[PDB]
């Protein structure tokens, strides 16, 4: 909302004459009581000969791209100057504003008598924007007849010493979308007496003698008030005086004709939107009703609107007269020939206006005020104010008839219910001991009726403050007018908290451990890439395809939420690689979204109580499962090149080691088992287990997936479900025998299909507790042991808890380990030695 300081000042000055403040101080006062000042715009300075002129001749220059005019302009004292101008929105006889040689316009533009378009031009005719007066629109500024004489000083006529304040009003303060509301706020901030410009001393009531027009209202439309009053015999050729056109311009409204200008003007002054109908274009009774399915209306911009059954209309016998509270209709619109006007002062349902205008994308000046609730007590004051102004400007007569529907039954008292509050509640909420009388004084200032009864205040807010419903609402009024800056800064005592949960600590430890091992964390987008699971070649019934879908994604082809973190990680990997960073290891820790059913919403639970435990469980059960995952991808060199050697390319074993890094960080033991699971390579894919629970997969990606997706060759990947890895808090008590150890190596031949870990497990089971350590040294294949067999050499370390092991006790334990391997995996002993 835009308004000029002069207007605001004039309204404040009625009750406090002489009041006047600098723009900087006004800005600061508005910020501290809660109004955001987006911009302070002093009307840009002019200097030198910028004066009113009168166009006395127009010659059309031909031959150029555009139409161009050479104008004789009267600039005062019977002096005429030739001026070239490209605008077309003016005629001979019009008052305009000329910047003549020697003048300077805002932005440092000096005017000189240049030669333009073949003729000499002694200056220019100015637009409102070139004067920094108002919005840049097509054509130059034309002042209304009689506004000033040729030669009058531009700065003074235009009022260029004004300042326009551009505010962003919050939706709880609809009453501030007008000079009435902001001036009242200023009166509160500065402790002034305030004269309400909507009051009866300032808007004396007009006569009330018979209905102004037949009206039916279906009350379930939520209309609260609907008043009409006619003005007859206005001159359709009259234009608004300059003072009115100017204020409209500074508030961002272009003047068009008095009947419309006056409704816009009174809207800005008092905050009650107003509309002017051509009464001779109304056919029969005016009806307020909901639209029907499929119904259409043409608004006064000539655009056809598809209506909704929740849209409230004004109709007559023949057509729609308005989309109520949003925009008037073409059929009753004031036109160039309109002589008899019916003025509409209505109060619509805020939510109804809010839904309708957003559906139609019509955030009009009226709609935005009705959305935030317009004061229903001033409809006839605004109607009367607006009829007088129109009759005076356009030379009509105000008819003494008035329709004023005030509900079924009529409502004669508009203020909200009384609110009841302890006198010191604001002091407690603020942590400030305000002087006595403070909250009652501030609550009267904003217009409430306040009565005292011991220590409890009863507060009845005014009708323009529908936001004041509870004690907290009143606290805010007291605190913001006192100023939040007086509230001290006092650290509370927070309780003895328990710190981070075990899960929270684990997710920190996993991140630290992966980062130290060379992985770089990314923040993964939950919006899956288009067609990713077809690139992966997943089966139609793969659970990962069962995705929750977003209705309004920013990219139409990416509406599916991620069931797996790998797509986001591979997308970051491709990005790094395409920028020349080809040796990369990335990880992410984030939830996924895994629905178990079709989207099911749970109906509104009443908010005047807490939901029950069963309602909470039902809300939870309606959501997709959202477990925490950890995942990582690797490509390129795992070990970089340097003086030590050529480096080492990423291999599947690096993904297995990432599993082990995460398991150590989680303090759990994992086992890895061969698996076939896209998008992994079937021969280089491990499924990961904690106990007998599957927690995810790791290994090298499938070469066909790599190739279809444009991934680096040999890319490896890991994804684990953190929710499936049990919590663990071990309390170790390691036995540390100091007696000497015995070292032996053993080589065992097994079928090639036997996993090395199964052999190690068997060796461990047979050797017993004397076996302190076992490590796989060598995997050897060759023709002399059989084409489908392999030799595994294990280093064994034996140690007794209470004595020096004999080398023969060690060999007894080795014999038992060999036998166990023989019985469990069919191992055959090839040889052993002392290490």
């Amino acid at each position: 909302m835009r308004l000029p300081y002069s207007w605001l000042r004039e309204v404040v000055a009625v009750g406090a004459s002489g009041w006047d403040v600098t723009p900087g101080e006004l800005e600061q006062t508005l910020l501290r009581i809660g109004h955001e000042v987006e911009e302070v715009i002093p009307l840009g300075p002019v200097d030198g000969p910028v004066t009113v002129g009168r166009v006395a001749d127009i010659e059309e220059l031909t031959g150029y791209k555009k139409p161009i005019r050479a104008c004789a302009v009267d600039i005062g004292d019977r002096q005429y100057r030739e001026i070239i101008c490209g605008a077309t929105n003016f005629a001979v006889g019009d008052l305009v504003v000329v910047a003549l040689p020697g003048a300077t316009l805002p932005g440092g533009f000096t005017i000189s008598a240049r030669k333009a378009y073949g003729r000499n031009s002694d200056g220019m005719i100015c637009s409102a924007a070139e004067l920094n007066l108002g919005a840049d629109h097509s054509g130059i500024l034309v002042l209304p007849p009689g506004a000033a004489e040729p030669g009058a000083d531009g700065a003074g006529v235009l009022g260029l010493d004004d300042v326009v304040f551009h505010l962003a009003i919050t939706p709880d303060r609809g009453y501030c979308m007008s000079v009435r509301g902001l001036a009242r706020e200023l009166a509160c901030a500065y402790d002034l007496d305030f004269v309400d410009p909507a009051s009866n001393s300032r808007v004396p009531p007009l006569p009330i003698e018979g209905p102004a027009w037949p009206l039916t209202v279906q009350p379930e439309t939520g209309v609260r008030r609907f008043a009409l009053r006619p003005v007859i015999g206005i001159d359709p050729a009259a234009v608004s005086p300059w003072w009115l056109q100017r204020r409209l311009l500074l508030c961002g409204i272009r003047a068009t004709c008095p009947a419309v200008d006056v409704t816009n003007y009174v809207m800005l002054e008092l905050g009650h939107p107003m509309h002017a109908h051509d009464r001779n274009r109304i056919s029969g009774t005016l009806g307020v009703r909901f639209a029907r399915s499929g119904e259409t209306a043409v608004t006064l911009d000539g655009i056809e609107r598809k209506l909704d059954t929740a849209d409230v209309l004004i109709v007559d016998d023949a057509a729609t007269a308005a989309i109520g509270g949003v925009m008037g209709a073409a059929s009753t619109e004031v036109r160039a020939d309109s002589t008899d006007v019916l003025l509409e002062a209505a109060i619509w349902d805020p939510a109804a206006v809010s839904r309708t205008q957003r559906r139609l994308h019509l955030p009009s000046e009226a709609a935005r005020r009705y959305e935030r609730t317009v004061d229903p007590a001033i409809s006839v004051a605004a109607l009367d104010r607006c009829a007088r102004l129109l009759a005076d400007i356009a030379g009509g007569e105000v008819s003494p008839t008035l329709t004023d529907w005030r509900g079924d039954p009529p409502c004669d008292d508009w203020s909200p219910p009384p609110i009841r509050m302890g006198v010191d509640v604001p002091d407690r909420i603020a942590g400030v001991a305000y002087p006595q009388g403070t909250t009652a004084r501030r609550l009267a200032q904003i217009g409430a009726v306040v009565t005292h009864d011991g220590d409890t205040l009863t507060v009845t807010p005014p009708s323009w403050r529908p936001d004041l419903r509870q004690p907290a609402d009143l606290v805010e009024e007291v605190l913001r007018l006192e100023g939040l800056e007086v509230i001290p800064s006092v650290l509370p005592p927070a309780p003895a908290g328990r710190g981070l949960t075990a899960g929270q600590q684990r997710r920190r430890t996993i991140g630290r451990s992966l980062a130290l091992s060379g992985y770089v964390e990314i923040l993964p987008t939950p919006f899956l890439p288009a067609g990713v699971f077809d690139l992966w070649g997943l089966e139609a019934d793969d659970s990962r395809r069962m995705t929750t879908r977003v209705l309004n994604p920013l990219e139409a082809d990416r509406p599916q939420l991620a069931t797996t973190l790998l797509p986001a990680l591979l997308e970051a990997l491709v990005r790094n690689v395409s920028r020349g960073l080809v040796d990369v290891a990335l990880f992410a820790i984030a939830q996924v979204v895994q629905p178990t059913e079709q989207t099911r919403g749970v109906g509104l639970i009443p908010v005047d109580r807490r939901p029950t435990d069963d309602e909470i469980a039902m809300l939870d059960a309606s959501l997709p499962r959202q477990p925490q995952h950890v995942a990582a991808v690797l490509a390129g060199l795992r070990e970089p090149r340097g003086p030590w050697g050529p480096g080492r390319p990423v291999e599947a074993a690096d993904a297995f080691e990432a599993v082990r890094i995460i398991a150590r960080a989680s303090r759990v033991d994992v086992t890895l088992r061969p698996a076939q699971y896209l998008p992994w390579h079937p021969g280089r894919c491990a499924q990961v287990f904690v106990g007998e629970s599957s927690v995810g997969h790791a290994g090298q990606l499938h070469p066909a997936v790599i190739e279809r997706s444009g991934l680096p060759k040999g890319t490896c990947a890991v994804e684990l479900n953190l929710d499936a890895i049990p919590c663990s808090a071990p309390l170790p008590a390691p036995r540390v025998s100091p007696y000497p150890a015995v070292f032996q190596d053993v080589s065992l031949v097994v079928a090639a299909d036997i996993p090395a870990q199964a052999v190690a497990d068997a060796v461990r089971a047979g050797a017993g507790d004397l076996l302190e350590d076992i490590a796989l040294f060598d995997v050897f294949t060759g023709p002399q042991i059989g084409e489908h067999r392999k030799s595994l050499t294990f280093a064994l370390r034996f140690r007794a808890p209470d004595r020096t092991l004999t080398e023969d006790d060690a060999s007894a334990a080795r014999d038992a380990a060999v036998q166990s391997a023989a019985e469990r995996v069919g191992a055959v002993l090839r040889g052993w030695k002392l290490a």
């Binding site: 710190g499 981070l500 074993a653 082990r660 390579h681 021969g683 894919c685 390691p734």
Partner: protein
């Protein structure tokens, strides 16, 4: 062309099994290390108290006699000030020693900071005990001090119970019995109800506590008629010994990697 592709496919599928690996082979070429279990116990104790608003303070292990004994209300001829229990710095009567508790850190903190003060001091302390299964001359202590207006024994018990729950589980709690220390009055010994395990829940002695003695407040310039304070201390090696069931303290101090590695990295 029905079967150009079916066995062109099952050709490529056997190329994939021909390049299979044993996914159970060892992969760890950078073996994990381990922060020390006493350091990790200290870290968990510190976090427990940070999360209640306390802060941690540190100080030198070679300390003045002023802060180790005199500021703590030890009489001039108290036996603790001798060579039988305390390591002194040569030569004789140098008033310099290896600190016997971390309390001198709380003295230093009371001198340096404004009240109220809620301070944990964890650190290395020294006693002339021979190294054996349940003693070490070098050990680690946690001591806390809270000094504020209106602190009572009830607040002491609340902090002790919160501490116990954090280190021994939600079923733990503490009990106090009257005892004596020069720097507290009243003084008590703290037992912890060790439920989670032990081979059958029982009370275990954990350490000492009490209300800081008014002479300690006076020697730091604090008015004991306006401020009161509670204090407590426990040994980390002793706590680890009875909580984890570690029978030989020599393992905690000798530096064998086999003692540390089963506790994990501690990241």
């Amino acid at each position: 062309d029905e079967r150009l592709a079916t066995l062109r496919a099952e050709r490529d599928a056997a190329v994939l099994v021909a390049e299979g690996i044993d996914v159970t082979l060892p992969s760890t070429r950078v073996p994990a290390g381990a922060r020390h279990p006493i350091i990790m116990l200290a870290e968990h104790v510190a976090d427990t108290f940070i999360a209640m608003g306390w802060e941690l303070a540190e100080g030198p292990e070679v300390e003045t006699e002023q802060f180790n004994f005199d500021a703590l209300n030890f009489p001039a001829d108290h036996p603790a000030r001798g060579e039988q229990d305390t390591f002194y710095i040569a030569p004789e009567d140098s008033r310099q020693l290896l600190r016997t508790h971390t309390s001198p850190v709380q003295i230093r903190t009371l001198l340096a900071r404004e009240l109220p003060v809620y301070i944990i001091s964890i650190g290395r302390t020294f006693r002339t005990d021979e190294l054996d299964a349940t003693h070490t001359p070098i050990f680690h202590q946690v001591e806390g001090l809270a000094v504020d207006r209106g602190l009572s024994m009830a607040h002491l018990r609340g902090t002790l119970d919160a501490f116990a729950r954090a280190e021994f589980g939600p079923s733990a709690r503490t009990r106090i019995r009257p005892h004596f220390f020069p720097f507290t009055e009243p003084s008590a010994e703290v037992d912890v109800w060790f439920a989670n395990k032990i081979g059958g829940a029982a009370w275990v002695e954990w350490g000492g506590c009490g209300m800081v003695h008014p002479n300690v407040l006076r020697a730091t310039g604090i008015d004991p008629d306006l401020y009161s304070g509670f204090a407590f201390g426990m040994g980390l090696e002793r706590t680890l010994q009875f909580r984890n069931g570690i029978p030989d303290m020599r393992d905690m101090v000798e530096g064998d990697v086999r003692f540390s590695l089963p506790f994990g990295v501690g990241a």
